[PDB]
C-alpha cells in the first residue's frame, strides 16, 4: 500500500511539502511517482507524471523529487486557489498500479 | 663548433591577443630563419551544473539545446511513443541530474595550433616595414613547399598529433583459388587535437619564413644594415581562436518499438553550453635565434570566407582548408536477433540497435570554382580553364622534386586581376598568392 | 478543447448488469488507449482494466477479472465497459481516462485528460 | 608568358572501340609530351525483374545463379533444415519478388579507368610508324618511374579514387607500466571505383609518353620534320573493358539451429545477371597540346594471361597486376549471448551470428617464378637467380632517387631470349620490357 | 655486361650462436658493399598437455600461470560468484582438458629478424681489425639514412611483413550542408611476425655497411691490400633471440551478474608455458658478393637497457626502439540489449559483453631524457637543451634530402663525454653514436 | 476458420482460379498458405507448401500467390485428369494449423 | 519409391481403446517426424499430435489432449498412436504424414508424402 | 572454525507443527544462502527448499510445497523452517547447509560446510 | 533416479574405483556430478563439487572424472581412516537435484 498524509495546512505565500511513502520498502525512480490534483466536482489534472516531469499548461510553481526514500511534492508561492486534494500513485510489480490517500490542503 | 644564443623580449609580460615587439638587435654577423619557442599552460574548463528534465536552455552559435521530457521527441512539442532520456558522460559514465558541479566540458586545440599563433608578422627597421605576412601564406607554403619526407617531425613542431598503429593478434582466413593466418592493423592517435579534461602544456617551436633566410649566401650583412633599429612585430592569436570546447555531457535516448520483432534503439545528442575557459599564459617564450660564426611559377589558393568566420561550427579545423567542405557521418550499429520460443521461428522475436556515442565524421572537400579565368590587362594569361588542370597536372609536370602535389582542390598552380566562373557564389571567395617562388 | 463524457451510472440492484459508455471529442480516438479508474468513497483510487488501441489486447485486475468486459467502437469513438455480478462494494466513482506510452505502455504512465467521472451505487 | 593551344580531331564523331587518327600537324615550334582530355558520360544500368522463389536461371561466366526454395541449401537438391530465403537490396532495403522493374545493377569503373583507354597508340609521319606502345608498358612505367610524392594528384588524372580519413572522438584507455584519452582513425573513400547507381561524368586527363618528349632540349624541330604528314593513331578501349556490373540484388538466408544455445545464422549470396549498359559517349575530347615559345638498366614485368583474359571474374582490377593473385575473405560476425532463466547460468540460452552483406576482399599477390634464367646467345647474362634479388635489392641499390621500389613480385629489374623456371606452368606467362631508361 | 659471383665459407657447418669466419679473399678487382643470403628452416614447436582444473603450474619470466576453479577469481583464493572457466584455442576452437598432446604453442619471429642476426661483425686482414660494428649502429642508420621511398622492398630483405589493404563494398551515407555511396578501407598483413603454427623457411638477404663501400670511387685496390689475409668474422644471433613463443591455449572465463539487467561477461587470459623450440638450421647461406669489371653532423641514439635485457616480456619487438615504451590496450566489447515482456520496457531485461580473445596493443613511446647536456672538455658543445630541438628541428633544417625525419624521441641529431638530466634514472641508459656521416 | 468455395467448374484447356480466405482477418505470408490435392482413393500430394514454393516432381502448370487478402491458386492449361479435390490450410497462433473445405473441381 | 502404411482401423464400441500403427519403407525413418491428421466425413482436416525425431518432445491439440498418447519405435520403424475414451465423433479418416522443418519446425510446414489413410468408425 | 548448529528436532505426534532453527558462527551469514537437505533412514538424500541472501526469493520441492515455510533472520544470524501437516514419512535427518553460486546459483552447486544434522521422528 | 553400488571393499594401500550412473540416460558435464563423504556422527565434507574440482583443505589423493557414461571416483593410496560412506548427487531438469545411494567402503 501507499502511506500519505491525512491533512495539511499552509499559510498564504508560504512553502509547503507533501510526502508519499511505502509501507515497508523504499522509493526509487523505478516506482514511477506521479502527483495529481482534484478540485471539487472538476476532472483531475495531471501535474507530475514521472518523478520531475510535468505536462504543458501547468504553472511552473510546482516541483517534486525523491528525498529520504519518499516522494516529495513541494509548492512554493501558493495562491488561494489551491483549495483542493492531492494524492500519490506508484507502480509496483510488472503491471501493478497503486494509488494513495488524499490531502485536503487548506490555505489560511 | 657553432652555438646558437637566445634573446629575450624587452616589452615584458606577453599576453594573448596583443601585439609584441621583439628586438633581435645585433646578435650574429650573419643570421637566417628564426625559431620561436612558446610554452603554453593548463586548459581546464569551468565546472557546470546538470540540467533539469524540463530545461530548454539556449545554446551556442544560435542553436537551441534541449533536454526532452519522457515520451517526447527532441523537441518538447511533438509526442513520441516510448522515448526515455538520461544524462551520460561521453565515456558512458552516468551523470546525476540537478547536481551542482556535476561535469566539466572537454577542451581541445584547433588543428595546427602553432600555425594560427602568428596571425600577422611585420619585419621592420625604423619604419618602412620590410616584410608582411600572415597565416594563410604559411598554410600555402606548407601545402606546397615542404617535402613529404620532412613531415612527421615537422608535425610535432606545430603541436599536431601523429598516428600510431597497433595489431590485433592472429586470425584465421580462407584463400580462394582459380586456410591462412593473418594479422589486423589499427590506427589511433592522441594529443592536443584529442579532447581531454586536462591538457598538458604544449611546446610550440614556430618557424619564421623569409625570402633572404632560405640560403646562407643570401643573408644580408648585419654591419651594413641598422642593427639598433630592427624591431619584429608579432600579433599573437586570440585566446578564443586556439582552444575550443567539446561537450562533456550527452543526452542518451532509449526507445522501444512493438510489432512481431521488438526493436530497442539507442541514440545520442550532445548538450553543448559554452562555459568559461581558464586563462592560458605563455611562459618561457624565448626565441632561440640561430647564430653561426663565419612571371615565374606561381602558387594561388582560394578559400571561402565562412572557413575563417566565427559563425562556422567547425572553424577550428576548417580554417586551413581551401574549398568548402561537408561532413559525412557513418553511424555504426550493433544488430543482434534473438529467438525465445524455437517453434514458429518465422521472424526474430527481439532485436537490438545499440549505437556508438560519437559518430565518425569525414570532412569531404569539394571544388568551389568550376572554371578559372585570369585576365590581366597587360597579358591575357589564362582564360576558361578547368580547375583540374591547374590543380593536378601543372604541379605534376612542373616544379621538380621540391614541389609537393596538392591534396585540396582549393589551391592550384599557375605558371593582379583574377576572375572566377564559379557557381557557389556567396561573396565569400578570398584569394592568397605567392609569386617569389 | 478536448472533452470526455461518461454515461450509464445510476442506482441498480445487486447482482445485475451495468454498461458504462465513454465518449470523447476534440481528439483522435484511434491512436489512444482507454483506462478505467475506480475511486471508492473515503478510500484510494484503483485501476480496473486496459483496452489496446484497436482492441486486439486487453488486461484486467485481480479482483475484477472474470466479471468485467471492456470493448471499443472506433467508428463512433466510444468505449464500452460491461460489468456483471454486482455487489455492494461497487459503489464508487468511475473515471474514463486516456494514456500515452512513456516507459511502461500497456498499463499507462502519463494518464492525460481525466474525465469528470460518473458515480455508480448499489 | 606562354599559353598552350588546343586542337580538334578531323575524323569526327569519336566512338568507343574504334581507331581514331588525330593530326597534331604543325602547331608549335617545339613540342613535348601531349595531354588528352576525355569527358565520359552517364553509366546508369538497365531495369530488371525480381526472380521467383523457384527460379534457377543461368548466370554469367558460366556460373549458375539460383534462388533456393524454403527448406533447401543453396542448391535445389539437398534438403537443409530451417533455411528461409528473402530478397534484399545491397544496402539492406527489402525487394519484392516477382515485380516488374524492381532493381538496377550497380555500375563501377575498372581500376585505373584512364589507363586502359589507350590500349594501343601509334606515332607515325606518312607511313614508317615511328613509335608503338600500349597499356602494359605504361603500367610498368607507372610502377617504377613516377615518384611516390607525385602520386595523389596523378591518381586523380586517371580517375582513381583517393582515401580520406576521419576520427571517432575521445576514448578511454589503460596504460601499463613495467588511464588516458585516445582517438581512433578510420579510412574511407568514394569515386569511380565505388559501385554506384549513377556515375557522374568522369574527366580523364591522360598523359602521353615518348622518348624525345622527356626533356625540352630533346624535342625534334618542327620545320625539319614533315608537319603535314604527322598522324597519331589511338585504339580506344572497348566499352565492355572499362565499366563493369556489381550485383544489385542479394539472396539473404536465415537459419535456426536447435540445442542448448539456439543460434540464428544469417548469410548472403549475390544474384548477378548481366544486364544492358547504357552507351557511353566521348564528348569534349580535345587534346590540350602543350606549346611553348622559344645494355643499361632494364625493367621487366611478368603477367599471367588470365589477368587480361575475359574469363577472369575480377579482370577489371587484376589487369594491371603482375603475378597471379588470390582472394582472402574475412567475414565478420556479431555474436551476442543472452540468458533468460537466471537459474542455470552456465551455457548461453540463445546466440546470434549476424553477418555483413559484403565481405572484405584482400588481393594477396604471390610470386609466379621461383627462379629466373636469361640466357642470350651473345651474352650469358643471368642464370639460376632468385626472384627476390631482381625484385628488391637491385632497385634498392641501383637507380638512385628517380626509381621507386617495386611493390609486386611479378616485375623486376635487370641491369631478347628470356627463360623461366617456374612451377605454375599454364602457358599463361607474358613478358613486358623497357630498356631505353 | 657484368656478373656477380658467389663464394662459400671455409669453416663449414654453420651453427647459430657461434662465430663464423669467411674469406672473401681476392675475387674482384674492385669490391663494394656485400650481400649475405641466409635460408632459415621450419619453426614448429613441441607438443604439450592440457592442464587440469586445479593446476597452478609455474609460468615463465617469474609470472605464475593459473587455471582457476569454478566459482573463483583468477587467483585460487578469493571466491567470485558465477565464474566458469574453460579451455579454448586462440582461434576459438575447444580444447579438451587433461589430454596428452592437446595443443602446440605458436611461433613468431622477432621484429626485423634479419637485423638481429649480425649482432657483431669484424672486418680484419691478418690482425689489426679494421672495422667493428653491431646491430644498434645498423638500426640508427636505418632510422635516418635510407629514404622513405626505398622502404617497402627493403622491408622484404630483412624478413619484415608489409601491410595490404582491402575494401568492404558500397555503403550509404548522409551529407550535411552548412545521401551518397562510399567505400571502407581495411589494412591487414601476414608474415614472419604473425604467430603461426608452422613458419615457411625465411630468406634473409642481409646487407653489409662500410665507410669505403658507399661509392664506387672509394673502393680500395685489391692488389695493394693483402688479398689472402682478409677474414671477416660474424657473430650469429642466438637461437633464443630471433624466434619467440605465443600462447597456443587460452583460459576463457564466463560470468553472470544478477539484478534487473542480467549481464553476461566473457573474458580471456593466456596460459603461457615455455616449451621446446625445434632447432633451426642455416642452409644455402652463401654471400652473393657483388663483383664488377673495370665535427660534422652527428647522430646519437639513447636506449634503456631493459630493451635488450632478457627480462623484458616484449624484448623481441622493443630491442630496436629508442626510448622506454608503454602498452595501451583497447578491449572492444559487443553490447546487445534485449527485452522480453514488452510491458515496462524501461531497462534492458538482459545484456551481453562479449569480448575479443586478443586485445589491441599500442606501443606508445615516451621521451626518456627531459634535458640534454653534452659538456666536453675541449668544446662546451651543447648544454641545457630540450630534446625536441635535437629530435625534430635539427633534422628538418639540416641534412638535406638524404636524411629522413626521426620518428622516435630517443634518437637525435647534433651538428666523447655526454651527460643527461633525465628523471627516469635507473642506470639503464645506453648510447650509440655515428660521426662519419 | 477458413472459408473456401463449395464447388467449381472449368472447361478443358481453360484457366481456373480458387480463393481461400479467413472469417474476419486478412492473409499475409505469415499465415504460410498451402495447397494440396486429393484424388479419390489415392494419398494426397503436396502442391504448394509455402505461398509460391513447390516440391519436385509436380508439373509446372500450377501457381499460387496472395491477392485481395486471399490465397489464390491458379491453374493454366488444365488437362482432363484434374478430376480431384482441392483444399486450403493455414497457420495461426503459434502452433495452430487450420485446414479448409474442398472443391470438387469438374472439367467439362 | 517410399511407401507409408497405416493399420489398426475398424469398427469399435464407444469408450474403448484403439491402437494405430504407422509403418514406412524406402526412407530413413530416423531423421523424420510423424504427424497424424484427422479428416471428418463431410468436414475439414484437423491436426492431432506431433512426435519429435527421437520421441523426446511431443505436443497435442486442445480437444484431444489427455486421451491420446503418441509414441515412436525407431528399431523396426513404427509409429504408434494409442487413443482411449472413444466417442461418436471419432469416426473419421486418419492420415500418418511426414514433415520437414522450414520456418516452423515442430508443428510441421512442408508435410511431404501423405499416407493413404485408414478409416475409423465407432 | 565456522560452525553450524541445528535445533528443534524431537518426537512429535503426526499432524502437528514443528520449527527447525539453524544457527551459524565464524562466518558472515549475510552473504550466504541456506539450503535444507533431508536424508531418510536407509534411503538417499533429498533437497527441500532454498532461501535467498536477504529472503526476497524462495523455492521448494514438488512433494513438500504448501507445507514448508523457510525464512531467515539476519539480525542474530538464524534461519527458521516451519513445517506443518506432519506424517510418518517425515522421520529423517535434516541438515542445514551453506552454498556458493558457481554455474547454477539458486539451487546451490558447491554446498560447503554441511551441518551435523538433527534427527526428527514422528 | 541414480544407481550406485551397494557396498565395496579395498585392501590397504590399493586403488579403488566407484561408479555413479543414471537409470536410462548417460552422464555428461551438464549433469554436474558431486562426490561427498560421510563419516559416522560427523558432518559431511565436500570432496568433488564439479566433475573434477575440489575445495581447499582436502587431501590431494582424491580424483574423479566421467568414464563410460558414468561418474567415476578413484582413490589411490588409501589409508585406514577411510571407513566412511560415499554417495553421488546429480543435477537434472532446470532446478532438480537428485542424490544417490551410499557405499560403506571397507579397508581390510
Numbering used by the authors:
A (entry chain L), F (entry chain H), I (entry chain G): 3 to 110
B (entry chain A), D (entry chain D), E (entry chain C): 71 to 248, 304 to 419, 463 to 583, 606 to 627
C (entry chain B), G (entry chain F), H (entry chain E): 1 to 122
Copy the relevant paper text.
Three copies of p72 and five H240R molecules constitute a pseudo-hexameric capsomer and a pentameric capsomer, respectively. p72 is one of the major protective antigens since monoclonal antibodies were shown to neutralize virulent ASFV isolates.
To define the epitopes of antibodies and expound the characteristics and the neutralization mechanism of the antibodies via structural analysis, we determined cryo-EM reconstructions of five antibodies (B1, F11, C9, H3, G6) in complex with p72 at resolutions of 2.75 Å, 2.98 Å, 3.48 Å, 3.24 Å and 4.36 Å, respectively. In addition to ER1 and ER4 from two adjacent monomers, the class III antibody epitopes, e.g., C9 and H3, include extra residues on the ER3 albeit with significantly decreased residues on the ER1. We found numerous clashes between antibodies (B1, F11, C9 and H3) on adjacent p72s in trisymmetron and zipper, and also a few clashes in pentasymmetron and zipper. These four antibodies have potentials to cause the dissociation of the capsid as a result of the mechanical forces generated by steric clashes.
